[PDB]
Structure formats: C-alpha cells, structure tokens
C-alpha cells in the first residue's frame, strides 16, 4: 500500500466510487485587518482577522504538486482598552484575540486527482499533528510621542474534526477540504509595551504570522468520492466575480463626497495663501 | 402516509431518485441600508433594501431542525422628497418602496435530508399561506429642528411560484429553495410626519420589521431530487471568502486619505488653542 | 447536421452523456474603475479594469435566446505618469494597459439546453473569429487649467484556448464557458493630449468601449456534458448574496465618521458666517 494511492471501490456505466489516501503539507497563513480612526491618531477603531489565501507549489515524492490554502478564525474574543475619553490618550476600541473558546478553520486544495471533480465525499478523516503559533511585533505608528508595540502571545493549534468547504475568490472557486483546529494557551503571553496590561493569554490579531511567510503543518487525508469513470471531465474552477455592486456604488458615492469635501477644504486653505 | 416523507421513486447502482415532502417554518426578516449624506445632516442620500440572512432552530414533530433563511426584494420603486435646495431643509434623495409590480424572494434551507446533497430537482411545488408585513417608526435624527418620523405602511404577501437558488455568505454556501411572493397593498399607508406627504401606499424601506424579531409563515414543499444511494455523502457548505480584494484596497486608500485629512483638520483646530 | 445539434453518445438509466454543437454570439463589454485622489483634483489614484457583466437577448434560427456574458482582463501592465510633486501638476499614480503579455477572459452563458445542468464537460473546443478592440476618449476633468484627453488605442483580440468558469453575481450564479483571447498590438496608439506622452501601443483602461454598447464576436462551441436522462431537472441559478458584511460594517463606520467630520466643518463655517 502506497502513501498516495488511488483505488476504485466501485464502477458503474458512467460514474465510479474512488478512494484517495494522500499526504499533504498545509502551508497556511493568517492576515490582519487594521483600521485607524480619524482625529489625531491615538484612537483605533478595530484590529481583526480576515480570511487569508496563500497558493504555492511543493514537492511530493517525485511529483510537483500545486496547492492552495485559505485560513480563517471564528469565535474570537473582542477585547478593548481605553485610557480615557481624550484625543491624546492611546485607545483601541476593539481588538480580536484567539483563545480555547474560538476555532481556526483551514481550507486546503491541490491540483491532484482527489480534487478535480470532488463534489461528493464520505468516510472523510485525517491525522494531523499539532503546531505552535506565536504573535508578532506590531508597532502602533502614533503621530507624536512614544511608540507602543503589541508583542507576544503564543497558542498551540490542536487537530480537530475534518469536513468539506468552498474557497471562493475573484479568480478561482475550489471545492476544498476543511481542517478544523482548537486552541490551548501557552506560556508566552501578549502585552502592549508602555501600558498597564500584561500577563493575559491568547494570540493578538495585529501580527499573528510573526513575520513568517507561512505556518506549516503536515497531514494525511483519506476519503471516498464520486468521479466520472472517464477521467476527462472538468468541473468549473475559474471565476469572473461582480458581487456587491451596490457596495461598489456606495463606495463611489463616498469617494465623490470625500473628493468634494477635500476640494472645499483645499480651496479654503489656498484662499488664505494669496497675499 | 406521512407529513415528512422520504420515498424512493427509483434507484440505481450509486445514484437514486428520492421524493421529499416536508412541512417548514419560513421565518424571514427584512433589512434596510440607511445612508446619510454629509453636510449638516438634513440631507439623506439613500434608504435602500439589503438581502437579509437569518438563521435559527425550530421544533418539528419531535425533531429539532436547524434552518437558515435569506430574504431579498426585486423590482422595488424609488421615491424621492426634496423640501428645498438649502442645507437646512429635510430632503431624502431616494427611499425604496415595495408595491404590486415588485416581488419578494425568500431562500430557505434546513439541515434535514432533502437539502444535504440537493443539486438536481424536478416536480418542485409548494403550498404557502399569506402573511402581513408592516412598517415601524424610523425617527430621522435631525441635529436641530423637529423630528420627522417615517411611520406606517402595510402590505399583504401572497404566495407565488417556487424555484431553486443558492445562498452565498461569508460562512456557508447553501443550495436552497426559492419561494417567491407577490404583493397587494393593504389599508395602512406609510407617511413621514411633520411633512407634506401622506396617503400613499407600499412598504417603507426604513423599518420594515416593525421592531419584530422575524416574520413567520408556515409552508410545505415537495420535490424529487437525485442523491447518492449511499446516505453518507456530504456536499461542501462552509466557506472562506476573499472576494472584492480590489474593493478592499480602494476602501483602504480611502481610509488613509480620510485619516490624513482628519489629521490636517485636527492640527488646524489644535494650533488655535495655545495662549 | 444542424448548426444547433444535440446528440446522445451514451445513456444509462438516470444519467446520459449528451453532445452539443451550437453557434453563439458573444456580446461583451469592458468596464473601467476611476478613483480620483483628494486635494484639488490634479492627482488620480487608479484607472483600472473591473469585471463587467452584460445580459442580452439575441435571435437564433427561429428562436429567441437569452444570454449572460462577463468580461475580465488578466496580466495587464501598470503604467503611471507623474510630472511634478506639487498639487497643481496633472499626475496619474497608476493606470492599466493591455499588451501581448495580457489576456482577456470572457465567460458566456445562455438559457439553452447546453447550460441547464452543466457541471461536467469534456471534448471541449470552439471556433472563434478575431475582432479589434479600440479605446475611446476620456477627458480628465481638472479643476482649472487645460483638459488633457486620453484618446486612442487599438488592439486585436485573437481566439485562444477554452475552459469552464463560474459567473458569480448578486442575482444569478452560472456554470459558464470561459473563452480566452490573446492580444496583438495594432497601429492606432493611445496618447494623453497636452502632455509629454504619445506613440505607445496598447489599450487604455478609461474608455475601452469607445462609446459602444458592446463588442460583438460570433463563435461555435462543441462539448459533451452529463445531463440527467429526465429532461425536467434544474440546477440552482439565482442567488441572494450577503458576503463582505465586515466590509459593509467598515463602510458604515467610515460614513459615520465622515458625516461627523463634514458636520464639524460646516459648523465651523456657520459660526464663521454668523456675525
């Protein structure tokens, strides 16, 4: 029995039940969304996560396999920290942290045969190994004064249930495999330098990647799918997306309004420069 | 016979044609998008509809069934009301209304067997009962002056044809059942108070829920779907979306420009407080 | 053989491999995104492409066929023109052009029998004719001074490989046929008038249509798909999308802060105009 086998557990006139048991190297990555409120620059609106794609190409045992991964988080906890109600105090109205109560989702896909026309799957299971994820060092760029830095945080990701999912994008749509992960706090705790907060567990959402190009976890997955016996059929992969056109229109109207306001402000600033 | 049947009208090696006939509780909900123009606060750029998700769990005859319902509208008319060309008159560039010519779409999904691998359907039919949808009281927060309140509006939703649809979201992707509703205006009219507009029919797009948690309508549906004979196959549902990255980029450039402008304004206002 | 044949190359009980050989009239259209930076109005942020939907209805040989097309571009080159660092020089931070190294994707879909339940396709091939896409005239509306006009640009689209794709939209989701096009630069060049740039091949991303309703190209396609034997099955087409709720929330917060800032500004002008 090989490591990357391909079996036919049944075969009808057109369709066929095939079994696929294959090793994988999930090279995934987080991505953070920072939002800085207006005013002076001491007030932050949100620091959250975003579903983060990463496509790559790794070597199997003599095969070059192109892969595609997409990470995300759910059930994260929304902490806050307000030093006061003034324009000059450092305040973060909301930032997200990962803990036991939350879960981490990783969608995975490859260019192998297991995924080409995978729409039905059963007997799905996987044996993944646990890893560690440490937070980064994010220096809050303040307009004037000292520079606080969010530094620390370490959480171990433990394997959990496996399912299917779909990785939609502006280029491709993939019927993908969804590995779930639970969390356990570790000794390195995250804290903001020059602040009265420290020794609290979790992983920050400012810079989870720690500057790493990716986090890597090895695995194996076994399943049984329905594929056409003729191995020439192809399911649609690429996309041409035009979703949220109302949102595009709202953004256009907001751009028009902000351009008119900036033109008004610039004219009122320039009239005083004619002496 | 049964009220929640599952019949086998045909069967082959791997596939099969199953007939499902089930009662359901369509608990849907409207949602509004109130955009307020800049300036002083007397001018409103648009008040539109937005497709509204709502997920719940209700009790069948000894079963606890999880469900998910997405409401939308189509063919809604656009009314407008301008009281003057000044910054100090209450003007609504556009507000959306529902009438006979328009239609209301409701995509419905449950965790039961009928929807687990539904990609093909025929002999689709449905028996739905009519309900009433009424508008609440949306008080326009005018900085100064009186307080216009958009109030009233009632419409009768009558059943129409049923079809298929796909509910996409940032979490789940659901091959769902699309119930369609036609409208007949009722006696209660919608009106903005302290304003020269009244005795016009439809539904206000401001507070269509009337402060309610949902609008419930019972129903029953019958169909014939193609399912793998092995009742263990699962179709991808969950997602991790990264759509409209270019839109996110434009929003980020907008936010940076807006923060720079706000910093300029705040420095200009702060320089005049040094005595 | 008819120009719009439909043949059966294999038929089991529930499924059947149906061959289709049909003529099509792809009428597509570019769409441009223009983001103008703030300040006076002398700096433009981006002039890029946006995937563009276009639905039409044309006449087959005694039949009326509704269609849906979606044009996109990949691998475009990012040029830019900056003539000075001052707020009064005309600058364009980044604008897109198309050349040999780029490709033009066109997703196509019809209401015909070929696209009713198409999820699997083999033996795909098509005979498409080549056309010429010519850019138009975009007048950069500067606040004051002269009015440069980006005028010209011609490029010939030639047939290339064919694949599948999925057209996602806020109304319909279509399992569609993806036609590729490669580019050969033509003689008419595009040049910004009243500027030091001219005689550079490609197509401009401001007005590609040249005031046209669409770009027409006729073709023929030939495939073999899996269709249930019963000609009554239907695959979900319509949608009800609520994706990017986080983006909607960001936009709402941005609109709130922008209204607050415009209110503060107009209040400063009212107190400075209340003597």
- Set of chain A residues whose Cβ sits within 8 Å of the Cβ of C261: 38, 261
Query: Quick count: other Cβ atoms within 10 Å of Cβ A120?
Result: 24
Which chains would you list as touching B if contact means 3+ CB atom pairs under 8 Å? A, C
Exposure letters B199-208 (e unless 16+ CB within 10 A, then b): eebbbbbbbb
Tokens (6 digits) for A17: 């039940």
CB contact under 8 A, B228 and A143: no
Query: Quick count: other Cβ atoms within 10 Å of Cβ C59?
Result: 9
Instruction: Give the Cα separation of B178 and B118 in Å (integer).
Output: 13
- Set of chain A residues whose Cβ sits within 8 Å of the Cβ of B259: 36-38, 41
Identify how the structure was determined.
cryo-EM
Measured in angstroms, the CA of A132 and the nearest CA of chain C are apart by 28
CB contact under 8 A, B240 and A10: no
- Set of chain C residues whose Cβ sits within 8 Å of the Cβ of B108: none
Instruction: Give the Cα separation of A20 and B45 in Å (integer).
Output: 56
Q: Which of A18, A143, C49 is nearest to B266 (CA)?
A: A143
Contacts of C191 (CB under 8 A, 6+ apart): C150, C151, C152, C197, C198, C199, C200
Nearest residue in C to B37, CA atom: C259
Which chains would you list as touching A if contact means 3+ CB atom pairs under 8 Å? B, C
CB contact under 8 A, B163 and C230: no
- Set of chain B residues whose Cβ sits within 8 Å of the Cβ of A266: none
Measured in angstroms, the CA of C98 and the nearest CA of chain B are apart by 18
Instruction: Give the Cα separation of C96 and C102 in Å (integer).
Output: 11
Q: Tokens 């223009």 belong to which residue? A: C34
CB contact under 8 A, C52 and A242: yes
Q: A–C: how many Cβ contacts below 8 A?
A: 135
Identity of the residue in A37, A247, A253 whose CB atom sits nearest the CB atom of B247: A247
- Partners of B215 in the beta sheet? B28
Contacts of A3 (CB under 8 A, 6+ apart): A21, A22, A23, A61, A220
Nearest residue in A to B237, CA atom: A165
Measured in angstroms, the CA of B113 and the nearest CA of chain C are apart by 17
- Set of chain A residues whose Cβ sits within 8 Å of the Cβ of C226: 14, 228, 233
Q: Which of C46, C232, C234, C242 to mutate to test the interface with B (most CBs of B within 10 A)?
A: C242
Instruction: Give the Cα separation of B55 and C246 in Å (integer).
Output: 18
Measured in angstroms, the CA of A114 and the nearest CA of chain B are apart by 15
Q: Which of C29, C38, C175 to mutate to test the interface with A (most CBs of A within 10 A)?
A: C38
Q: B–C: how many Cβ contacts below 8 A?
A: 133
Instruction: Give the Cα separation of C236 and B119 in Å (integer).
Output: 7
Distances in whole angstroms, Cα of residue C31 to Cα of each of A264, B12, B121, C34, C44 = 30, 49, 36, 10, 18
Give the per-residue SS3 of chain A: CCCCEEEEEEECCCEEEEEEEEEEEEEECCCEEEEECCCCCCEEEEEEECCEEEEEEEECCCCEEEEEEEEEEECCEEEEEECCCCCCCCEEEEEEEECCCCEEEEEEEECCHHHCCCCCEEEEEECCCCEEEECCEEECCCCCCCCCEEECCEEEEEEEEEEEEEEECCCEEEEEEEEEEEEEECCCCEEECCCCCCCECCECCCCCCCCCCCEEEEEEEEEEEEEECCCCCECCCEEEECCCHHHHHHHHHHHHHHHHHHHHHHHHHHHHHCC
Backbone angles phi, psi at C269, to 5 degrees: -75, -30
Give the per-residue SS3 of chain C: CCCCEEEEEEECCCEEEEEEEEEEEEEECCCEEEEECCCCCCEEEEEEECCEEECCEEECCCCEEEEEEEEEEECCEEEEEECCCCCCCCEEEEEEECCCCCEEEEEEEECCHHHCCCCCEEEEEEEECCEEEECCEEECCCCCCCCCEEEECEEEEEEEEEEEEEEECCCEEEEEEEEEEEEEECCCCEEECCCCCCCECECECCCCCCCCCCEEEEEEEEEEEEEECCCCCECCCEECCCCCHHHHHHHHHHHHHHHHHHHHHHHHHHHCCCC
Instruction: Give the Cα separation of C132 and C157 in Å (integer).
Output: 6
Give the per-residue SS3 of C190-251: EEECCCCCCCECECECCCCCCCCCCEEEEEEEEEEEEEECCCCCECCCEECCCCCHHHHHHH
Q: Which of A175, A177, A222, A161 is nearest to A18 (CA)?
A: A222
Q: What is the resolution of this structure in A?
A: 3.3
Pair A35, A94: CB distance under 8 Å: no
Pair A266, B268: CB distance under 8 Å: no
Q: Tokens 């649609």 belong to which residue? A: A236
Give the per-residue SS3 of chain B: CCCCEEEEEEECCCEEEEEEEEEEEEEECCCEEEECCCCCCCEECEEEECCEEEEEEEECCCCEEEEEEEEEEECCEEEEECCCCCCCCCEEEEEEECCCCCEEEEEEEECCHHHCCCCCEEEEEEEECCEEEECCEEECCCCCCCCCEEEECEEEEEEEEEEEEEEECCCEEEEEEEEEEEEEECCCCEEECCCCCCCECCCECCCCCCCCCCEEEEEEEEEEEEEECCCCCECCCEECCCCCHHHHHHHHHHHHHHHHHHHHHHHHHHCCCCC
Identity of the residue in A122, A167, A169 whose CB atom sits nearest the CB atom of B234: A122
Tokens (6 digits) for C239: 């949608």
Instruction: Give the Cα separation of A115 and A112 in Å (integer).
Output: 6
CB contact under 8 A, A244 and B243: yes
Instruction: Give the Cα separation of C81 and C95 in Å (integer).
Output: 9
Q: Tokens 């044309």 belong to which residue? A: C58
Instruction: Give the Cα separation of A229 and A8 in Å (integer).
Output: 10
Tokens (6 digits) for C214: 């669409």
Pair A219, A126: CB distance under 8 Å: yes
Instruction: Give the Cα separation of B33 and A53 in Å (integer).
Output: 30
Q: Which of A210, A189, A184 is nearest to A201 (CA)?
A: A189
Query: Quick count: other Cβ atoms within 10 Å of Cβ B156?
Result: 14
Instruction: Give the Cα separation of B143 and B193 in Å (integer).
Output: 17
CB contact under 8 A, B234 and A71: no
Nearest residue in C to A265, CA atom: C39
Nearest residue in C to B54, CA atom: C242
Dmax over CA atoms of chain A, in Å, equals 89
Q: Tokens 């009722």 belong to which residue? A: B186
CB contact under 8 A, A122 and B232: yes
Nearest residue in C to A244, CA atom: C170
CB contact under 8 A, A266 and C72: no
Pair C28, C71: CB distance under 8 Å: yes
Q: Which of B44, B141, B26 is nearest to B87 (CA)?
A: B44
Pair B183, B196: CB distance under 8 Å: no
Pair B34, B42: CB distance under 8 Å: no
Tokens (6 digits) for B7: 């019949």
Q: Tokens 């799957």 belong to which residue? A: A121
CB contact under 8 A, A165 and B238: yes
- Set of chain B residues whose Cβ sits within 8 Å of the Cβ of A246: 33, 48, 50
Contacts of A163 (CB under 8 A, 6+ apart): A124, A177, A178, A180, B234, B238
Q: Tokens 């490859």 belong to which residue? A: A110
Q: What is the CA radius of gyration of chain B?
A: 24
Backbone angles phi, psi at C262, to 5 degrees: -65, -35
Instruction: Give the Cα separation of B64 and B56 in Å (integer).
Output: 11
- Set of chain B residues whose Cβ sits within 8 Å of the Cβ of A122: 230, 232-234
CB contact under 8 A, C257 and B253: no
Instruction: Give the Cα separation of A221 and A211 in Å (integer).
Output: 29
- Set of chain C residues whose Cβ sits within 8 Å of the Cβ of B68: none
CB contact under 8 A, C239 and B163: no
Q: Which of B97, B104, B129 is nearest to B183 (CA)?
A: B104
- Set of chain C residues whose Cβ sits within 8 Å of the Cβ of B246: 33, 48, 50
Pair A150, A137: CB distance under 8 Å: yes
Q: For the sheet containing C5-11, what is the strand order?
A: C5-11, C15-28, C215-228, C121-128
Identity of the residue in A14, A247, A264 whose CB atom sits nearest the CB atom of C251: A247
Identity of the residue in A36, A248, A262 whose CB atom sits nearest the CB atom of B259: A36
CB contact under 8 A, C247 and B247: yes
Instruction: Give the Cα separation of B250 and C88 in Å (integer).
Output: 23
């Amino acid at each position: 029995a090989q490591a990357n086998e391909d079996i036919v557990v049944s075969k009808t006139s057109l369709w066929k039940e095939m079994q696929y048991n294959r090793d994988i190297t999930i090279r995934f990555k987080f991505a953070s969304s920072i939002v800085k409120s207006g005013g002076l620059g001491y007030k932050w609106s949100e620091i959250s996560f975003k579903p983060a794609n990463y496509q790559y190409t790794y070597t199997r045992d003599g095969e070059e396999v192109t892969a595609h991964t997409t990470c995300s988080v759910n059930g994260m906890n929304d902490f806050n920290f307000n030093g006061g109600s003034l324009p000059t105090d450092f305040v973060i109205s909301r930032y997200e942290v990962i803990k036991e109560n939350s879960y981490v989702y990783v969608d995975y896909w490859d260019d192998s045969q297991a995924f080409r026309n995978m729409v039905y799957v059963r007997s799905l299971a996987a044996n993944l190994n646990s890893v560690i994820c440490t937070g980064g060092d994010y220096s809050f760029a303040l307009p004037v004064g000292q520079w606080p830095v969010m530094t620390g945080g370490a959480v171990s990701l433990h394997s959990a249930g496996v399912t299917l999912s779909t990785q939609f994008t502006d280029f491709v749509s993939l019927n993908s495999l969804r590995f779930r992960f639970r969390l356990t706090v570790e000794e390195p705790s995250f804290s903001i330098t020059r602040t009265r907060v420290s020794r609290l567990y979790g992983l920050p959402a400012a810079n989870p990647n720690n500057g790493k190009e990716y986090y890597e976890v090895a695995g194996r997955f076994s399943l049984i799918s329905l594929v056409p016996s003729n191995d020439d059929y192809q399911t649609p992969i690429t996309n041409s997306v035009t979703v949220r056109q109302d949102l595009e229109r709202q953004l256009g109207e907001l751009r028009e309004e902000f351009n008119a306001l900036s033109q008004e402000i610039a004219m009122s600033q320039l009239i005083d420069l004619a002496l």
